[PDB]
């Protein structure tokens, strides 16, 4: 029963139109708890979940300070990648970052992240051992080189194995009621005729937490993947997820097919038959 904390940062340049907008969001497993936006009136880290509001006012001052510092670094990081890649002064570019950690059911350190992507492709990344970096290309190698000399991994190793896991532990403790909960999927089945020759059999999973789900069709107890339409897990908007798997079935063959749901709120995988 693992748990994770992640921070997703984006810095999108807009040349001639002021400084780049920086957004940052924090997530504890599939729930968002924080937000910061450089293009916002407040200019502060703001809560996005009930349980983070129980943090003292000093938290909000320190968090605002830390996110503000990174935003500044990322605007110069955008200007450096631009000269590194011999790219024109014209044109919008994106620098994204992901950092955070993974913990055990007991709270032990499992894994730690700290990585960037420039214009949607990997730039630099801290390796699993947290001592070394992966440089995607040549520009990133210049950074690899700069960061090795500057003991950046050493510092992030301490953040990742220390601050991160501890901070996660208290978010899990404070956010017990909503995070440690497991919402089972409410299943149902729909049937829509394509023609008098065939029909679509849709099978839904609604209101579930976390987003890890598995939906699989079977024709006569043998796994189907030939004519299966499987949409991406989508948020319902209330902090729960939705998913469905459709299948093309000839008229009358509907009783040969079964939908199979695997969720960590389900003791045994639910089987679904029409009707």
């Amino acid at each position: 029963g693992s748990h994770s904390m992640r921070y997703f940062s984006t810095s999108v340049s807009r040349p001639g139109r002021g400084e780049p907008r920086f957004i940052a969001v924090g997530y504890v497993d599939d729930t968002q708890f924080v937000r910061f936006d450089s293009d916002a009136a407040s200019q502060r880290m703001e809560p996005r979940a009930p349980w983070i509001e129980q943090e003292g006012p000093e938290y909000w001052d320190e968090e605002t300070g830390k996110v503000k510092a990174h935003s500044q670094t990322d605007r110069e990081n955008l200007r450096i990648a631009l000269r590194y890649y011999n790219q024109s002064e014209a044109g919008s570019h994106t620098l994204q970052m992901m950092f955070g950690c993974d913990v055990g059911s007991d709270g032990r350190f499992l894994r730690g992240y700290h990585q960037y992507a420039y214009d949607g492709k990997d730039y630099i990344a801290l390796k699993e051992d947290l001592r070394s970096w992966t440089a995607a290309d040549m520009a990133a190698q210049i950074t690899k080189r700069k960061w090795e000399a500057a003991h950046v991994a050493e510092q992030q190793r301490a953040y990742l194995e220390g601050t991160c896991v501890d901070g996660l532990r208290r978010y899990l403790e404070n956010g017990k009621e909503t995070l440690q909960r497991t919402d089972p999927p409410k299943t149902h089945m729909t049937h829509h005729p394509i023609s008098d020759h065939e029909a679509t059999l849709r099978c839904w999973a609604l209101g579930f937490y976390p987003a890890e789900i598995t939906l699989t069709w079977q024709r006569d107890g043998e796994d189907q993947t030939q004519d299966t339409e499987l949409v991406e897990t989508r948020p319902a908007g209330d902090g729960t997820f939705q998913k469905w798997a459709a299948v093309v079935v000839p008229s009358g063959e509907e009783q040969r097919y079964t939908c199979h749901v695997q969720h960590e709120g389900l003791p045994k995988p639910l089987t679904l038959r029409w009707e």
Binding site: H70, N77, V152, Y159
Partner: peptide, 10 residues
């Protein structure tokens, strides 16, 4: 908990 400043650029 956001990471403390890394005062090292690209």
């Amino acid at each position: 908990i956001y990471f403390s400043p890394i005062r090292v650029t690209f």
